[PDB]
Amino acid sequence: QCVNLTTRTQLPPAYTNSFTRGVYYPDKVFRSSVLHSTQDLFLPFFSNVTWFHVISGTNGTKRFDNPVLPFNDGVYFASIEKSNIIRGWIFGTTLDSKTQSLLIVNNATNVVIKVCEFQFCNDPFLDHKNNKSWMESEFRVYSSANNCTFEYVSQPFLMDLEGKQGNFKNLREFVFKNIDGYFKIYSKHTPIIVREPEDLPQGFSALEPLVDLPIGINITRFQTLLALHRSYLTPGDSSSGWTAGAAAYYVGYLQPRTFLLKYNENGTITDAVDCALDPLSETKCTLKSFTVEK
Amino acid sequence: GIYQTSNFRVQPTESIVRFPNITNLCPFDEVFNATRFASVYAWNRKRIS
Amino acid sequence: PYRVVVLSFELLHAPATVCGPKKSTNLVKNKCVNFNFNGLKGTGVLTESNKKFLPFQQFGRDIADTTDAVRDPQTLEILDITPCSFGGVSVITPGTNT
Numbered sequence: 001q002c003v004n005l006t007t008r009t010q011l012p013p014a015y016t017n018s019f020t021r022g023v024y025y026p027d028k029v030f031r032s033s034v035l036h037s038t039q040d041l042f043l044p045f046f047s048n049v050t051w052f053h054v055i056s057g058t059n060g061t062k063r064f065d066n067p068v069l070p071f072n073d074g075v076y077f078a079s080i081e082k083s084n085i086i087r088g089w090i091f092g093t094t095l096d097s098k099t100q101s102l103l104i105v106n107n108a109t110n111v112v113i114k115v116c117e118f119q120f121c122n123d124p125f126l127d128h129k130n131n132k133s134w135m136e137s138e139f140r141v142y143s144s145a146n147n148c149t150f151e152y153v154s155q156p157f158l159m160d161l162e163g164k165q166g167n168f169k170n171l172r173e174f175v176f177k178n179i180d181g182y183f184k185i186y187s188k189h190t191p192i193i194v195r196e197p198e199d200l201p202q203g204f205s206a207l208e209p210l211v212d213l214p215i216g217i218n219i220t221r222f223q224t225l226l227a228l229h230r231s232y233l234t235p236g237d238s239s240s241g242w243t244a245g246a247a248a249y250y251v252g253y254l255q256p257r258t259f260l261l262k263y264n265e266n267g268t269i270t271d272a273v274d275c276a277l278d279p280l281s282e283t284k285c286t287l288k289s290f291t292v293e294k
Numbered sequence: 295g296i297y298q299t300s301n302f303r304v305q306p307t308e309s310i311v312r313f314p315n316i317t318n319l320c321p322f323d324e325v326f327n328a329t330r331f332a333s334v335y336a337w338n339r340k341r342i343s
Numbered sequence: 344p345y346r347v348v349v350l351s352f353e354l355l356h357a358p359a360t361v362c363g364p365k366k367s368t369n370l371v372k373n374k375c376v377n378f379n380f381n382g383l384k385g386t387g388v389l390t391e392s393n394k395k396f397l398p399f400q401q402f403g404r405d406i407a408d409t410t411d412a413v414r415d416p417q418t419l420e421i422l423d424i425t426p427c428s429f430g431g432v433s434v435i436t437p438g439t440n441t
């Protein structure tokens with residue numbers, strides 16, 4: 001069923017600046033307390049990224065946001081939740097059961113990487129009933145499965161096992177690059193406990209490499225798949241009766257840039273500085289240090 | 295006097311190569327040890343990856 | 344009747360598919376040996392490495408961008424590598440006419 005559910009709230013995009021996120025281990029080499037300058041793809045510091053949300057505080061049956069997005073060179077996805085509303089992704093060029101599409105679906109038993117093509121609905125997603133026998137009774141992700149030649153299965157990426165509704169102790173950050181016919185996915189799941197629900201956390205992190213795929217197809221457009229826990233918070237009908245929960249996720253972008261990174265004694269990344277933001281940052285990059293004298 | 299004249303080194307004698315096991319393999323038994331075989335016109339076309 | 348199968352492998356090598364290295368070999372330590380850990384061939388002397396990699400790290404690197412430690416693909420232990428010993432020779436003489 002292509003649902004095409006009503007009460008479609010089309011709103012302008014909320015903007016949140018990119019506060020010193022978007023760093024990842026560029027390769028598999030190891031270092032020890034050194035300074036390194038690297039020219040590669042990164043998310044530039046302090047850039048306005050798009051904020052999307054699905055929340056039932058005021059509109060339990062009216063707040064859904066699953067539009068298509070362009071995948072120019074890579075994205076930095078981030079999500080803050082506690083009940084795992086975000087569950088899948090979709091990519092490709094035409095998405096008309098004619099071009100290969102990547103259905104990264106988390107599942108529960110095992111994450112599945114699929115290259116196959118499908119005729120997806122106008123508003124594809126998944127929903128699962130509030131019943132005790134929890135199961136995605138609505139396989140509304142698509143309706144046709146035509147042709148493909150590669151599939152892959154692995155252990156599903158872990159959850160924080162914090163299934164509450166208070167301060168969202170689930171925060172998951174992902175980066176998806178596609179170069180040289182390799183689809184590389186870096187990620188990190190930062191649990192934390194409490195944080196003011198204003199924007200993305202103000203701090204620093206790192207993005208360990210997770211997976212690589214040698215599939216090698218051109219990519220130009222994508223979007224996200226939300227599996228809903230359709231409950232009796234608005235009891236009765238299903239297609240129109242559901243809850244929007246409380247979920248927020250931010251979408252950024254990548255640009256070629258030069259960075260200076262430092263390593264600790266055991267080789268982890270503690271902090272880094274770009275080479276195009278401020279004249280002082282340019283001076284740090286050129287002098288190759290974190291301190292300068294008069 | 296003294297004369298810096300020669301350079302010496304120690305050369306190896308043997309080689310070693312390593313690889314991360316053979317854990318995954320291509321299942322080809324089902325081809326030869328097939329329960330039943332395909333007809334003359336039309337055929338099974340098995341893609342290996 | 345004869346049961347026959349025809350194998351047809353494609354080309355153009357953009358979708359690298361099957362391949363195989365196979366043929367693993369033995370290990371030695373504390374001797375001048377050539378090593379081909381993962382196609383990063385080198386020559387030198389092996390030993391242990393007390394330093395700990397990250398779980399995804401494969402082979403280390405030191406100042407001046409040189410290989411210094413590699414994790415063995417079989418036993419998953421990070422060994423340390425040192426270049427072969429070498430040096431220079433000086434000759435002391437008191438005089439040919441003496």
Ligand SMILES: *[C@@H]1O[C@H](CO)[C@@H](O)[C@H](O)[C@H]1NC(C)=O
Binds near residue numbers: 105107109112
């Ligand atoms: C989810 O896991 C089950 C358990 O093996 C599996 O049968 C099912 O195919 C998986 N889902 C998808 C979409 O593959």
Ligand SMILES: *[C@@H]1O[C@H](CO)[C@@H](O)[C@H](O)[C@H]1NC(C)=O
Binds near residue numbers: 264265
């Ligand atoms: C680095 O890691 C080692 C163990 O891997 C630990 O003993 C040490 O305290 C760590 N140091 C820092 C600065 O993280």
Ligand SMILES: *[C@@H]1O[C@H](CO)[C@@H](O)[C@H](O)[C@H]1NC(C)=O
Binds near residue numbers: 314315317
């Ligand atoms: C390789 O296989 C042997 C077989 O016993 C096993 O002991 C070893 O841990 C394996 N190593 C890897 C990296 O799979």
